[PDB]
């Protein structure tokens, strides 16, 4: 019923995994840093009208355990009534928190909510939480568990995407992310990380390789995997396929990074009361997925369901933003819906700038809010694939 509006969307720069600038920064500090930037931009905002803070975090362990959302509320000195809940829907946790915040507003029982994610994979690696599947061979044996990398190799094998095809996409992502950083597209969204003294720690996505070349990508060696068994397991399910063409390397897959993002979502009455200017509007969200062994073809039905739910078609969308977990996933999504190539990941993606699991959904969402405003266009569609065979998609309209 109630319409949900995005009033602010900011993100930290994404720090690399090996010798990264953010490895010394506690995950709680990345989120509190963004809260202190929202305070700086709206000093007179009555923080008591913030009814919840929803953070996505795929590995809620160690520095990221104990409800890090609540920790950020108390650490930043936000009102003790401002809640704080962590969620985990694997790679789409950041976008799921944004959608949940939007649905909480649409229900009317919530006025103004902070949403986003946080992930410091240099401090809390993926799999640190273990998992009800790994520590249980009976379930692992029956669900035929296959890590994300092999589903991507399998997708490229089935659809006929070659090693040069995925490296062609890896090159164009590094290029567009370089163009966007040069043009200043990220100037007001990427909030530099500073220490307790105010000294600079990171001001740019340091995983990028702007000097990437077709020749340099072709020399990389292909990628839970590197152990045994998962290839044969995947082909036991997809028994018509004979051999898996391993095309994905470190250069055409999403990088391991640290980062956090924040999106402020509220109702029109909330923004009007607090003098906030709307930037976009959550038109519709949707959830769907496909087989867990192929794992990553879930954003195709989730996109059709959110398009069907919004009453639109692909031709009505000005910008498509799909997370670059693997190059073959995007080429499949592009091949399926016949996405015009110049509407797809127009400012780069996770291959160039990184994929901070819990925070990625809210980062690429804020990427589109700024790009619709810059281009003066109406609609964008943000979607992420998920481990286990899920998918999430959202359509926003510039206000």
């Amino acid at each position: 019923s109630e319409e949900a509006f995005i009033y602010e969307a900011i993100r930290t720069p994404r720090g690399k995994q090996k010798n990264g600038s953010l490895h010394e920064v506690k995950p709680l500090s990345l989120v509190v840093g963004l809260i202190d930037e929202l305070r700086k931009r709206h000093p007179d905002l009555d923080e008591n009208l913030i009814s919840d803070v929803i953070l996505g975090c795929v590995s809620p362990v160690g520095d990221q355990g104990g409800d890090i959302a609540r920790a950020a509320v108390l650490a930043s000195g936000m009102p003790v009534t401002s809640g704080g809940v962590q969620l985990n829907r694997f790679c789409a946790s950041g976008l799921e928190a944004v959608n949940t915040a939007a649905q909480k507003v649409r229900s009317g029982w919530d006025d103004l909510v902070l949403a986003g994610g946080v992930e410091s994979m240099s401090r809390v690696p993926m799999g640190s939480d273990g998992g009800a599947m790994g520590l249980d061979p009976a379930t692992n044996y029956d669900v035929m568990f296959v890590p994300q990398s092999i589903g991507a190799d399998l997708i490229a094998t089935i659809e006929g995407f070659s090693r040069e095809d995925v490296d062609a996409y890896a090159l164009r992502s590094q290029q567009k992310a370089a163009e966007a950083w040069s043009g200043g597209y990220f100037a007001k969204s990427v909030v530099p990380v500073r220490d307790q003294n105010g000294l600079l720690i990171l001001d740019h996505d340091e995983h990028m390789r702007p000097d990437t070349t077709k020749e340099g990508l072709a020399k990389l060696k292909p990628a839970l995997a590197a152990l045994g068994g998962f290839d044969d397991v995947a082909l036991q399910k997809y028994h018509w396929v004979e051999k898996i063409n391993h095309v994905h390397t470190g250069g055409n897959s999403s990088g391991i990074v640290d980062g956090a993002a924040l999106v402020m979502i509220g109702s029109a009455a909330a923004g009007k009361l607090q003098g906030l200017t709307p930037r976009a509007r959550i038109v519709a969200t949707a959830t769907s997925g496909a087989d867990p062994v192929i794992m990553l073809t879930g954003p195709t039905p989730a996109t059709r369901k959110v398009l069907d739910r919004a009453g639109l078609t692909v031709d009505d969308i000005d910008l498509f933003e799909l997370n670059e977990a693997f190059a073959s996933v995007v080429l499949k999504f592009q091949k399926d819906l016949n996405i015009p190539d110049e509407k797809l990941n127009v400012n780069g993606g996770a291959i160039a700038m990184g994929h901070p699991l819990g925070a990625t959904g809210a980062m690429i969402l804020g990427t589109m809010v700024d790009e619709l405003e810059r281009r003066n266009a109406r609609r964008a569609l943000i979607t992420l694939c998920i481990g286990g065979g899920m998918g999430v998609a959202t359509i926003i309209e510039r206000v």
């Binding site: 490895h23 010394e24 506690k26 160690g62 520095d63 401090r123 220490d195 307790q196 003294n197 105010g198 000294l199």
Partner: protein
């Protein structure tokens, strides 16, 4: 770029021998001690650049010192001037310092520290970067990381390395949180020092003998610290270890309990830097330590504490309040009159320094009980191993309990500690002044009575002087020296030197009622009692005192000062100016004191005060207190209660400075910290003004603006004097 450098005279002498063992002898020609200053950083940069340049011809390194000390301290003169905008320079300095030590630590060859003396702060940090530490077991030698006492933290790798050596818990509790200084034997037993020798001449030979043996026996592990080996296991576990993660949340609360909630951010930062550093690699850990270090140096509390415990304390010990030109006069025999807590404690600290003490009282049974205070003190010291049986026997043998004035023959230094009464003190001095030596110092331990009045009871008034101790005398570090208007400058210096000889700190105060410490702690007590009469919860008053940083809450302190004595002071201070023609404005606390006396609850000595006293111990507040004073009817902010007690003392101190009672803010700061327990984070009741910080701002102006905000709400006794106005 990433360098070992940040004009100055070189401080390190270089010597390579035939074997290839380079000996770095630190010898700063600009002082008697090696100090971590610009000259050191530049020189250690040159030396480490040379150790790397000549790596093929160097088999080991020996770090030594040419001073009486090994290395002690850093550039406090620079650290205190660092503003918040200077955080980049401060961060880059400790990063440059640690980059030098980390290169020395990872040269691929053994480095040994020859510790010939004191290795404090940055000195121990240099030695902690070495693979082997050999300390000479000489007198006066100490080792420790006392940066926390100046509001800083060991930022040259001290926090990172001691945590890698002993674990988070042991390093924080034993070394870091308190800046404890160890004698070389204690240092070897807890692991700070590896081995000991008896003379400094054996050090460099033993260091080269260890380097030669280490290369022969353990070639692959030579020059490799324990935390640079594969399979390094941090003692006590890492924060992700489930054994440590179960008790880790209790560390900030235990620290918060010991500090009683007072604003001390240096221990809070040390604990954070220790735990955050144990979660990452060594290099990432030390960079975190640098950020917390820069966070402390640019803060106010560090500047408050650097001013008091470094500059003011050195100004006092150098004789800033000692009369100019006067020479030294020996003390052969000390005569103490009275064997109470004061006289007994005085006799102990005097005999502990080595002075022969005659302890007189009215009876031999009493004087023997006075010496028993020393015997029971030495008993605890023996079972805890802090003294030998030999020196303990000699100490007690210097205390001669007596009951005759004839045994004061040959006494050239008298310290009277009898009851507070003028005509009693006139009589006690009258019958000993002729027995003592003709140049004897005639000192009175009085808290309030003016020295000029007590001095007229003797003939040699120029040698009469007030020597105010504080109980317990064996542990309170201040001596308040009061100068009557007939007191000579020689007597002043003689008492001043005695104060340093017994290991205490002197302040010179001009004669006046209440002196400095009694007058100021009176305003602290009176503010608390006024709050009780206003209807504030007694538990909230004690909480304010402890959270303000005071060592003992004010109501508990009142029970020990005896409210009967407290009332007599106010009666004696009204007729001191009302009989003089002026006016006396009564304090609201006087009605509270008179009502507690009306109900027979005069204090702890009586058995009942604001607290219940059962079986010698103190068992909770008197329940009738809330009903008597309508407690709960006034609930001001806790910060107002804290500021009322801090400002009342800070303003009475400024009054003393304007009246010539005190002659230096160094005496005001140290006198308030060590005399009456003003919170160390303030740097003293005088530093508190120039470093106030709250919602208003920082500095003298913010203090005045806040003092006026308190005057509007609680009375004009908080109105700032003209001297603080600008």
């Amino acid at each position: 770029g990433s360098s070992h450098h940040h004009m100055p005279d070189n401080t390190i002498q270089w010597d390579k021998d035939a074997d290839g063992i380079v000996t770095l002898t630190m010898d700063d020609p600009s002082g008697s001690t090696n100090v971590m200053n610009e000259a050191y950083i530049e020189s250690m940069g040159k030396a480490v650049d040379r150790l790397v340049a000549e790596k093929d011809s160097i088999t080991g390194v020996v770090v030594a010192s040419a001073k009486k000390t090994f290395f002690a301290g850093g550039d406090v003169k620079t650290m205190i001037q660092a503003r918040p905008e200077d955080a980049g320079d401060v961060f880059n300095t400790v990063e440059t310092i640690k980059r030098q030590l980390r290169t020395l630590e990872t040269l691929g060859k053994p480095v040994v520290a020859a510790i010939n003396g004191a290795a404090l702060g940055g000195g121990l940090e240099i030695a902690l970067a070495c693979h082997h530490r050999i300390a000479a077991d000489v007198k006066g030698s100490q080792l420790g990381l006392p940066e926390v006492t100046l509001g800083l933290l060991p930022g040259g790798g001290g926090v990172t390395r001691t945590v890698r050596m002993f674990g988070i818990q042991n390093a924080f509790v034993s070394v870091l949180a308190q800046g404890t200084r160890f004698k070389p034997a204690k240092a070897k037993e807890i692991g700070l020092v590896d081995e000991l020798v008896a003379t400094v001449e054996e050090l460099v030979p033993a260091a080269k003998a260890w380097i030669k043996e280490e290369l022969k026996a353990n070639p692959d592990g030579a020059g490799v610290q324990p935390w640079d080996k594969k399979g390094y296991k941090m003692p006590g576990g890492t924060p992700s270890s489930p054994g440590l993660a179960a008790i880790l949340p209790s560390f900030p609360s235990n620290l918060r309990k010991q500090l009683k909630g007072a604003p001390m951010p240096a221990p809070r930062a040390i604990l954070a830097a220790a735990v955050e550093g144990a979660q990452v690699d060594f290099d990432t850990a030390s960079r975190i330590e640098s950020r917390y270090f820069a966070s402390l140096v640019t803060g106010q509390v560090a500047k408050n504490m650097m001013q008091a415990f470094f500059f003011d304390l050195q100004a006092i010990n150098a004789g800033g309040s000692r009369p100019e030109g006067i020479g030294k006069t020996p003390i052969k025999r000390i005569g103490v009159l009275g064997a109470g807590m004061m006289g007994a404690g005085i006799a102990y600290v005097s005999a502990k320094a080595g002075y022969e003490v005659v302890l007189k009282d009215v009876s031999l049974e009493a004087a023997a009980k006075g010496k028993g205070y020393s015997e029971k003190l030495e008993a605890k010291a023996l079972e805890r191993g802090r003294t030998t049986q030999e020196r303990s026997d000699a100490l007690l043998a210097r205390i001669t309990p007596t009951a005759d004035a004839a045994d004061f023959k040959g006494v050239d230094f008298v310290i009277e500690a009898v009851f507070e009464n003028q005509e009693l003190k006139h009589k006690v001095f009258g019958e000993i002044e002729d027995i003592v030596e003709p140049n004897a110092i005639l000192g009175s331990n009085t808290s309030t009575l003016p020295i000029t009045g007590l001095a007229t009871g003797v003939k040699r008034q120029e040698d009469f002087i007030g020597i105010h101790f504080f109980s317990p005398v064996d542990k309170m570090p201040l001596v308040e020296i009061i100068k009557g208007e007939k007191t000579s400058d020689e007597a002043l210096a003689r008492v001043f030197d005695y104060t340093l000889a017994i290991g205490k700190t002197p302040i010179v105060v001009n004669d006046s009622r209440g002196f400095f410490t009694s007058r100021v702690i009176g305003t602290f007590v009176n503010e608390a009692l006024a709050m009780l009469g206003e209807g504030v919860e007694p538990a909230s008053i004690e909480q304010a005192g402890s959270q303000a940083g005071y060592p003992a809450p004010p109501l508990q302190l009142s029970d020990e000062l005896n409210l009967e004595l407290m009332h007599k002071i106010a009666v004696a201070t009204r007729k001191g100016v009302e009989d003089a023609g002026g006016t006396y404005q009564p304090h609201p606390a006087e009605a509270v004191v008179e009502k507690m006396i009306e109900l027979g609850r005069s204090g702890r000595l009586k058995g009942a005060g604001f607290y219940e006293y059962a079986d010698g111990k103190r068992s909770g507040l008197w329940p009738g207190l809330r009903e008597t004073f309508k407690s709960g009817s006034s609930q001001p902010p806790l910060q107002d209660m804290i500021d009322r007690m801090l400002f009342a003392e800070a303003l009475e101190t400024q009054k003393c400075l304007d009246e010539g009672v005190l002659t230096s803010t160094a005496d005001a700061n140290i006198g308030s910290i060590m005399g009456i327990g003003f919170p160390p984070w303030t740097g003293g009741s005088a530093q508190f003004i120039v470093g106030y910080s709250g919602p208003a701002g920082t500095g003298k102006a913010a203090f005045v603006a806040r003092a006026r905000e308190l005057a509007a709400a609680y009375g004009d006794r908080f109105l700032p004097p003209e001297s603080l106005l600008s």
